Amino acid sequence: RTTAEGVARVRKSKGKYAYLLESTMNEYIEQRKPCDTMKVGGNLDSKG
Amino acid sequence: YGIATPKGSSLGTPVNLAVLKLSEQGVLDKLKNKWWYDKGECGAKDSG
């Protein structure tokens, strides 16, 4: 549905669900409790 | 990297709408995929 449901599927599906989103949100969720996400790969396209 | 026009010219605005159109259409991503890799002397370097 929204971004918070995408993060919640990553914590629940235990490495079976990846969630593609912005690189500015992929770092802040990584640096926040319960600390269960990481940032893999490079930036695919470029935005501003 | 930016396409640059002189100060107070008529081409400042239509070029500025051209680059953003070529980015949303992915033509800039299509070209960067092609000039670094498909002309690449190294073959399938991402796949290795």
Residue appearing with tokens 């969720």: A29
Q: How was this structure determined?
A: cryo-EM
Tell me which chain A residues have a C-beta less than 8 angstroms from the C-beta of B33: none
Q: Which of B20, B22, B23, B25 to mutate to test the interface with A (most CBs of A within 10 A)?
A: B23
Classified as helix, coil or strand, B40 is coil
Give the containing element (helix H, strand E) for B30: helix B27-33
Task: Return the residue of B nearest to A44 by Cα.
Answer: B29
- What are the C-alpha distances in Å from B14 to residues A48, B6, B8, B18, B21? 19, 13, 13, 6, 11
* Euclidean distance between CA atoms B13 and A33, whole angstroms: 45
